[PDB]
From a paper:
The toxin of the system (DarT) is a domain of unknown function (DUF) 4433, and the antitoxin (DarG) a macrodomain protein. We demonstrate that DarT is an enzyme that specifically modifies thymidines on single-stranded DNA in a sequence-specific manner by a nucleotide-type modification called ADP-ribosylation. We also show that this modification can be removed by DarG. The DarG macrodomain adopts a typical macrodomain fold composed of a six-stranded mixed β sheet sandwiched between four α helices and one 310-helical element.
Residue numbers in the entry: -1 to 149
Write the structure that this text describes.
Amino acid sequence: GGMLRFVRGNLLEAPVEALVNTVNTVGVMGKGVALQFKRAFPDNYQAYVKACERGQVQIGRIFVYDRGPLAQPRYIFNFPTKKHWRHPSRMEYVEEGLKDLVCRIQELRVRSIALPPLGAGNGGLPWPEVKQRIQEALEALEGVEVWVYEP
Ligand SMILES: [Cl-]
Ligand SMILES: [Cl-]
Ligand SMILES: [Cl-]
């Protein structure tokens, strides 16, 4: 029963197994979605900082933090949309990230996941095009309920 739904509300409240946080690769969660994630999920933030220090966080390479089998959300999928926090999000980086998103969902047998609009909206990437790429990527997931929070 896989299904893609586009919704409004507080991403952090989504009642799912995995949340996507939109991040950069330099180890800063200072604004926007990432700031909300830093405040809500401090252990993910520290793990993310260490993964960045190691060079593990790169374009097309989601950094997943596991909060444990009894947690909800269990996973934080730290999705890079840009290198430095001052740079804009870039469409190529969202495209490569969405491919890896599918990879990590499958690897981890995640059955429900919620995403922000991946750098779209409010002066960022064009939402119609981002929405289209999300649809292309994430309607080819069998059995996964995907919730996308609109700009
Ligand atoms: Cl940031
Ligand atoms: Cl958020
Ligand atoms: Cl956490």
